[PDB]
Design a binder for this molecule. Structure first.
Ligand SMILES: Cc1csc(CNc2cnccc2C(=O)O)c1
Ligand SMILES: [Co+2]
Ligand SMILES: [Zn+2]
Length: 330
């Protein structure tokens, strides 16, 4: 067995190896990368996503979300309060203001300490889930807007044609903006490129130990658990590394910097936070190995989870028994 300790692996493809996405994901898995639930990929030194980021200020953040915390420093939920629209230019200026700017700190470790100690006492604003892309159309390799669709993967593997399209999203972040503990919709893979700005710290639980985290979550968030049998899909719960360690949950951490890709693997629970103003782009994807995870993925049927048009068909084909009750909830 490759990577038995489930360590987060970091890859440095050559430009030749960077020319076939599916092949390289398969290679990473041949080295056991998926066992961690998350891998970093540093692109070839000659590669770039686009020429410059000089003309991105006019992008609109239609619904910025203020992330309000409730609970204890190391165990809390967050809810998203909708705010008025603003451009990326206005958002960047807000992120850099005295109220929201990254505080003085010695290094990544000091900032992480400050995050977990102080996160709940501030409500940062996140420009999340914005449909669009910052990859240049002429960028041929690892262009997140030119990946094969999950619908085409499902068709190629199962022989059924289905409706739906698969497009990327942009995430404009600031200090303390937070992504809660979750796996992807249908336990798909995700790929995340940090286009610009300050880093993004990630925490991840190995897929083979995902149920340990779920068990702990049920204990730490008893109300949320009773209301929905798959409440982590609401993407509201945070649990600090100190609390994970106290409860024996196996996990790893890694910081992603601008110009680097992260891939999350099927049923790899992850969470994290932004260090300061940044912009990331992400999309879900699938491989042949995902299919069996899709068939087993838990569903939120209480209506709280954000349901996309594309998800209907994946539940319909892969989880026909769940389809009726799931459709009632959403
Ligand atoms: C509405 C909303 C708030 S946080 C979120 C999901 N974000 C992520 C999910 N998986 C990985 C990384 C991120 C991220 O933020 O980089 C959606
Ligand atoms: Co994710
Ligand atoms: Zn639910």
């Amino acid at each position: 067995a490759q990577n038995p300790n489930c360590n987060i692996m970091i890859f440095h493809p050559t430009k030749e190896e960077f020319n076939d996405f599916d092949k390289y994901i398969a290679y990473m898995e041949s080295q056991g990368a998926h066992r961690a639930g998350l891998a970093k990929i540093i692109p070839p030194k000659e590669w770039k996503a686009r020429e410059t980021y000089d003309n991105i200020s006019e992008i609109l953040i239609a619904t910025p979300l203020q992330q309000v915390a409730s609970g204890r420093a190391g165990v809390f939920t967050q809810y998203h309060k909708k705010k008025k629209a603003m451009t990326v230019g206005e958002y960047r200026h807000l992120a850099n203001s005295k109220k929201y700017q990254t505080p003085p700190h010695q290094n990544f470790e000091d900032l992480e300490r400050k995050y977990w100690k102080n996160r709940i006492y501030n409500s940062p604003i996140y420009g999340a889930d914005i449909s669009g892309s910052l990859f240049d159309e002429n960028t041929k390799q690892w262009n997140l807007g030119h990946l094969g669709t999950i619908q085409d993967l499902l068709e190629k593997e199962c022989g059924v044609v289905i409706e739906g399209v698969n497009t990327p999203y942009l995430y404009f972040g600031m200090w303390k903006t937070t992504f809660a503990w979750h796996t992807e919709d249908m336990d798909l893979y995700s790929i995340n490129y940090l286009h610009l700005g300050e880093p993004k710290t990630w925490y991840v639980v190995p897929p083979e130990h995902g149920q340990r985290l779920e068990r702990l979550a049920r204990e730490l968030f008893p109300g949320s658990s009773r209301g929905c049998g798959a409440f982590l899909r609401h993407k509201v719960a945070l649990i600090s590394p100190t609390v994970l360690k106290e409860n024996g949950i196996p996990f790893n951490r890694i910081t992603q910097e601008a110009g680097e890709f992260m891939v999350t693997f099927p049923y790899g629970y992850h969470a994290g936070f932004n260090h300061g103003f940044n912009c990331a782009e992400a999309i879900n994807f699938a491989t042949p190995r995902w299919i069996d995870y899709g068939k087993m993925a838990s569903q939120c049927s209480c209506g709280e989870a954000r349901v996309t048009f594309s998800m209907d068909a994946f539940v319909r084909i892969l989880q026909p028994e769940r389809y009726d009750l799931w459709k009632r909830g959403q």
